[PDB]
Amino acid sequence: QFEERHLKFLQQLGKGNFGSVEMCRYDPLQDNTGEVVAVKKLQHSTEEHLRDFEREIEILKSLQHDNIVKYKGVCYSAGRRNLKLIMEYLPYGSLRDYLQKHKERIDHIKLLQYTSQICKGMEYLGTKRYIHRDLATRNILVENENRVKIGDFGLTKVLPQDKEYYKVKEPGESPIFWYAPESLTESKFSVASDVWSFGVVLYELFTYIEKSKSPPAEFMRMIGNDKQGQMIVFHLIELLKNNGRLPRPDGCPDEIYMIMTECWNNNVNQRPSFRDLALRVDQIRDNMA
Ligand SMILES: Cc1cnc(Nc2ccc(C3CCN(C)CC3)c(F)c2)nc1Nc1ccc(F)c(NS(=O)(=O)C(C)(C)C)c1
16 A cells, blocks of 8 residues: 655664564655654565565454554565565654653553553454464553553464464574473463563563663573573573572562462463453552552
8 A cells, every 4th residue: 555655764663583663754745744654674585584474464454452553554666575564653662662761750550551451452462363472572662651552463473273372483583581481392382471471571561671680681690691502591491490480570569470470380271361460450550549
């Protein structure tokens, strides 16, 4: 629906796993009344990466929800090379940077508002049998001080119709410090592993992205920064199997940390559902106010 002729590059917002996002202005009338949008593109437009990207575009086009970033369309060069994904532009950036910038103004009730919105988005994903796999505060965008949206689906996979997990081991490597143990061991991704990584997201939120307190920093301090390469993963594995966990962030109430640790259950079936998570978070929020 979008003509590359009319996309005006303004800035690069960020570059991730094989892709980049740019702030552009769609101005077809050339009269500077066009709207600012986000444009996602691939940087090695391989045929693998391109059909992965087309599956991602279909997934996003199929999602409609207040806490999911709005798909707007696609734009492709002459022929079908240089496929680009057009999305709404959220003006406050990732939840990670936003939380780091306004940490003295954002109180715990606000953190829980964000948490509840994240779990409603994730529950919508699950009702569509989608597994996000990559959920992290860097992937959560801020539309304004009262609304956040899950903002990238480059790793989202559709569950097989006959099973509740999806096995995928991708070249290059991903956020091991957000990954469930079964995803480190057997490359199994499921709603429950998304729940584990939501627990890590909640941890993130209550650390306010303090420098010492990132999951990579805490985990590599717990396993020792002396170790190298592949062995990192191995040690992480057993750190998780001896119930080594991320610590309670400073100032976090014990019930929020208990939600965190309950999503960090080694037993995949004993992890809470996103609807129960929203329930508990909304009732804690109600209690605080
Ligand atoms: C869809 C979308 C709609 N709007 C915005 N708005 C937006 C506004 C402001 C800033 C920053 C503020 C100031 N700094 C310095 C520069 C920009 C911003 F980064 C984004 N972003 C979007 N996607 C996006 C963009 C960039 C990213 F890195 C990520 N991360 S990502 O998912 O992991 C991955 C890299 C895609 C794998 C996602």
